[PDB]
Amino acid sequence: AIGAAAISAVGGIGVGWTLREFEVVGSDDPAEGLTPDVLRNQLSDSVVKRKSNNQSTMVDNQNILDGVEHTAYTEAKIAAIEELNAGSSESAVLSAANSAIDSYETTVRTNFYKSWNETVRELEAMTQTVIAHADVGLSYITDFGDPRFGNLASGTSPNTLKDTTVSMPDGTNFTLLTFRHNTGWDSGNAAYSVVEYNPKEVVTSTNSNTYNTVDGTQYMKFSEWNAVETEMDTVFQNVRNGISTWVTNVYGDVQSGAIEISDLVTPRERATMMAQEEGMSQAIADLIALNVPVDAEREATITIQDTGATLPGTFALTDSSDGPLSAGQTYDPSTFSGDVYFTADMSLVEGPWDAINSGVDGGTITITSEPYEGTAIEVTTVESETVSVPAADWTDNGDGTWSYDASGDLETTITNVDSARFVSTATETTYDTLQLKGAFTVDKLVNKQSGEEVSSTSFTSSEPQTDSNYITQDEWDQLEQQNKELIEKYE
Ligand SMILES: [Br-]
Ligand SMILES: [Br-]
Ligand SMILES: [Br-]
Ligand SMILES: [Br-]
Ligand SMILES: [Br-]
Ligand SMILES: [Br-]
Ligand SMILES: [Br-]
Ligand SMILES: [Br-]
Ligand SMILES: [Br-]
Ligand SMILES: [Br-]
Ligand SMILES: [Br-]
Ligand SMILES: [Br-]
Ligand SMILES: [Br-]
């Protein structure tokens, strides 16, 4: 429930890992000649960045996993129909369908385990850095509850990355890294602390916490990683059992040639082609491909209660039963059954900055709250002069106040702040998909072309795939038609 400083919403959501081979985000290596304070800040920043990345892609996209089931059913049914039309044996029909599931599951699982492996490899690289600098304690980077490294040998890591073989459905083996951590004491000591886990299971936990705590940030949470793992197992079990029930009831009665899907462009295929040539943001194209109810016809101007930030953009609900999002109404996403996704241009982000001191003493402007990353505070003085200050230029006083010296920017250095507002630092139109976590109010709902002001929202999605549906050509024709006109609406 933590994202862009300006919006409680989890930002930079990447759902592409459920539809394509996803490349992991690499580790940042700090310099040799560094100060303990600088190393601690750089390590804390890397942990925050890694957790934020993992939240947006794997960890916080739980309610879109029913879409993975939909994608897996589409792909397997097409493979099965081709075999049924060829007058093949029931085993050959199921073989083609399950080979499609095997390749799809391998991709989804490999992407998921690859991101865990990178998180765990990064921690080791960060641990090795702390060991080498010798000005920072291991208790800073590896804290599992009892970070007492008094009996651990010099130049030795308390971590061990164990190779664990995962049997991928396509017959191949994948090396999943099992994270083991031992503080160094003997079994018998009261201080003895050991943890060993991965997204699949907790091997051993002694005087330990699965998750790591670095500068107050809890990450590598087994409960978070295992939640996605157990849901992934559920989804692919349901597809395989469902396709078995489907073929058993469809074999013989559905005539060979009744359904012709050989040239069909699947919602998954449609979204992957968007990557080659992008006419819209990838995440909304992916959410459409996963059959998540979206509102393409309207444009909502939202305002965040706590922040004051206003944004125009398009909505997406994982559960359409979360009711219509009416204009003039205030909504708290913590109460909702599903997850709210908002796709909007970050450059347009704007809101009032009331947390500012009146006095401009010797050109110095002081603010009473942390400036938001990727935004600039536009300070207007009583002499009708304005100065744009990006967050990175605000110096922390450690008093809960931040200051900037505008002696080179203002004509009158000694003055009073008239008003202040925060605006985005983005040079161009930059689209982003956020998962709204904090309370928001829907200001206005603008129709897509005409510009009319509507009261409520209307979400649309194609027929969800079951173990007994997509028997008629009409069901399949509607799938391609409904999807291609949704993509057109965002272009
Ligand atoms: Br330094
Ligand atoms: Br597909
Ligand atoms: Br066919
Ligand atoms: Br890997
Ligand atoms: Br330390
Ligand atoms: Br120690
Ligand atoms: Br050990
Ligand atoms: Br000991
Ligand atoms: Br994480
Ligand atoms: Br946990
Ligand atoms: Br048949
Ligand atoms: Br819907
Ligand atoms: Br669905």
Numbering used by the authors: 8 to 498
Please quote the authors directly.
Haloarchaeal pleomorphic viruses (HRPVs) infect archaeal hosts living in hypersaline environments. The virions contain two major protein species, a spike protein (VP4 and VP4-like proteins) protruding from the membrane surface and a smaller membrane associated protein (VP3 and VP3-like proteins) residing mostly inside the virion. Here we describe crystallographic structures of VP4-like spike proteins from two pleolipoviruses, HRPV-2 and HRPV-6, showing that these proteins have a unique fold, different from class I–III fusion proteins. VP5 is thus a bona fide fusion protein.
